[PDB]
Amino acid sequence: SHPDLNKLLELWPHIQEYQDLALKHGINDIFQDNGGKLLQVLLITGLTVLPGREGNDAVDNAGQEYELKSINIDLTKGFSTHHHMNPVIIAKYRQVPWIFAIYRGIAIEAIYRLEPKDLEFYYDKWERKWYSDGHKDINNPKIPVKYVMEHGTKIY
Amino acid sequence: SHPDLNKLLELWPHIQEYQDLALKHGINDIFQDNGGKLLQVLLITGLTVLPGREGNDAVDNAGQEYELKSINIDLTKGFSTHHHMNPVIIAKYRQVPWIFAIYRGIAIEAIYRLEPKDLEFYYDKWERKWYSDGHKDINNPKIPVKYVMEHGTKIY
DNA sequence: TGACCAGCTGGTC
DNA sequence: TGACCAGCTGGTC
Numbered sequence: 001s002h003p004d005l006n007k008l009l010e011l012w013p014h015i016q017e018y019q020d021l022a023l024k025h026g027i028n029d030i031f032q033d034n035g036g037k038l039l040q041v042l043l044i045t046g047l048t049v050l051p052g053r054e055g056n057d058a059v060d061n062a063g064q065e066y067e068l069k070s071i072n073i074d075l076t077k078g079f080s081t082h083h084h085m086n087p088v089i090i091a092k093y094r095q096v097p098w099i100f101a102i103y104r105g106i107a108i109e110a111i112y113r114l115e116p117k118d119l120e121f122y123y124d125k126w127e128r129k130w131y132s133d134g135h136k137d138i139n140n141p142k143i144p145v146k147y148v149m150e151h152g153t154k155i156y
Numbered sequence: 157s158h159p160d161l162n163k164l165l166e167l168w169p170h171i172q173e174y175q176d177l178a179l180k181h182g183i184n185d186i187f188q189d190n191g192g193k194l195l196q197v198l199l200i201t202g203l204t205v206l207p208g209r210e211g212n213d214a215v216d217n218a219g220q221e222y223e224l225k226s227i228n229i230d231l232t233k234g235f236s237t238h239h240h241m242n243p244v245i246i247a248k249y250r251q252v253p254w255i256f257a258i259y260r261g262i263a264i265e266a267i268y269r270l271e272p273k274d275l276e277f278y279y280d281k282w283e284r285k286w287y288s289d290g291h292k293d294i295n296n297p298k299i300p301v302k303y304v305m306e307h308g309t310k311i312y
Numbered sequence: 313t314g315a316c317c318a319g320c321t322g323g324t325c
Numbered sequence: 326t327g328a329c330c331a332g333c334t335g336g337t338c
Contacts, residue, residue, distance in 0.1 A: 184335090185334090185335095188333070188334065188335090189333085189334080189335095208336095233326090234326080239331090239332095281327095285328090294328080294329095295328085295329070295330080295331085296329095296330095296331090297327075297328075297329095298326090298327085300326060302326080303326085
């Protein structure tokens with residue numbers, strides 16, 4: 001047993017209270033897939049994760065779907081994408097806007113919206129690379145946070 | 157923003173503390189790869205995670221390297237392994253022991269432990285397949301909890 | 313920065 | 326309970 005365990009138990013009833021809120025807003029595990037940071041983004045913007053979605057997909061009060069990515073700036077400078085990118089994956093995202101949220105560790109700093117139109121420069125490079133490489137799966141290429149800031153439009 | 161956000165503003169400080177607490181134990185993010193859930197197992201078992209660590213692996217006061225898995229018994233009935241199971245991986249597992257934490261949501265009910273002797277039954281079946289499958293990687297072959305509760309030592 | 317490398321896991325017939 | 330479907334990121338340079 002570790003001395004800090006006494007501290008963990010003091011906070012728990014508050015953690016469980018947080019996890020009860022996420023649950024109420026469609027999220028099941030706050031300790032996975034950025035589960036806990038999303039709920040923040042969802043409550044601030046007002047988007048909605050729906051029952052039975054694949055990945056972090058969200059919808060507004062009108063049907064529009066969006067793709068959410070989240071990054072911790074104390075650690076990296078490029079948003080992650082997919083561990084096995086290829087045309088098929090790009091197609092899923094192609095038509096929908098993306099929402100990118102930026103955290104200083106666990107504290108939220110900004111939320112930037114990006115139009116598909118702006119994300120085209122990137123889908124090209126990837127698809128193009130794919131071919132000119134032997135139809136081999138790019139391993140998590142990254143989107144620069146700086147690019148997102150200059151090209152996106154800050155909504156928080 | 158959504159009215160529930162206000163409720164989220166009351167619980168926040170209590171959340172940052174957990175994060176400050178996780179960061180004191182080698183956890184950079186409590187909302188990913190089971191950070192929160194992993195903090196728990198650590199303070200209980202008194203295990204330690206070493207920087208430049210490979211995933212979610214801890215050591216004891218004697219350098220014995222371990223592998224830690226987590227699971228929500230309330231929605232899936234088998235532990236995950238690797239998205240691309242293969243001989244390279246397997247040959248880094250059979251060398252070390254696995255701790256298994258069980259939760260009912262985010263509430264640990266137990267912690268069993270397994271020796272490489274116990275797990276052999278599975279690696280024998282996986283190399284077997286990969287070698288005649290056509291060296292085709294195995295995507296997240298699960299290990300049944302029942303198997304775990306019935307072949308290991310209860311640690312908690 | 314581009315291109316390298318890796319990690320946590322959940323759902324189903 | 327096997328053998329398939331799939332998701333979220335990070336790290337050295």
